[PDB]
């Protein structure tokens, strides 16, 4: 029940792409992954400049800070969460129906821990430099990540549908 897609972008395109996703997807809540703590804080600052509420969570924080933020997220205080690879036992927030890999992971085990489990969309931002990791992860998981279509069926991720 998670539909996986990729957009092909360059680093300089990623934010405009992300703004278009925010604009056109029927997001209830979303989780956005980056490949480091520093880039997480950078993207949270940027999402806030584009107009969207977000929280953020990363490896360089006290555990209890992270727990409270995530409890505040679960209760709907913000609509988007920006984070690093914090999930071990899966994502059990029901309202999250769109997960975004702002940075594509390197390892298949990283990718699995991001994408289990939003009905939901997993949208991958793929650069030329991610090409080997895309192939490796597709092969290891036994999965296909399809190109993002111009119209995403609402029945794939909006629960009223």
């Amino acid at each position: 029940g998670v539909t996986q897609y990729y957009a092909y972008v360059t680093e300089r395109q990623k934010v405009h792409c992300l703004n278009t996703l925010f604009s056109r997807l029927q997001i209830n809540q979303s989780i956005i992954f980056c490949n480091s703590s520093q880039r997480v804080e950078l993207l949270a600052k940027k999402i806030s400049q584009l107009g969207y509420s977000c929280f953020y969570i990363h490896a360089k924080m006290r555990q209890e800070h992270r727990n409270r933020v995530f409890h505040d997220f679960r209760n709907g205080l913000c609509r988007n969460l920006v984070c690093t690879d914090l999930f071990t036992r899966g994502i059990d927030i029901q309202a999250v129906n769109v997960v975004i890999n702002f940075d594509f992971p390197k390892l298949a085990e990283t990718y699995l821990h991001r994408i289990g489990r939003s009905l939901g969309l997993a949208i991958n931002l793929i650069t030329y430099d991610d090409r080997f990791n895309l192939k490796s992860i597709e092969e290891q998981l036994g999965t296909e990540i399809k190109p993002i279509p111009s119209n995403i069926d609402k029945s794939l991720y909006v629960a009223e549908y």
Partner: peptide, 30 residues
């Protein structure tokens, strides 16, 4: 930082990546 006034062109940009052809090149040479 670069944000045009129009929606991001997903479709044009996906034409810049011939996924199945790249993968085959990867398997052949890389």
């Amino acid at each position: 930082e670069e944000i045009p006034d129009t929606d991001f062109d997903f479709e044009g940009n996906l034409a810049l990546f011939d996924k199945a052809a790249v993968f085959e090149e990867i398997d052949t040479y890389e």
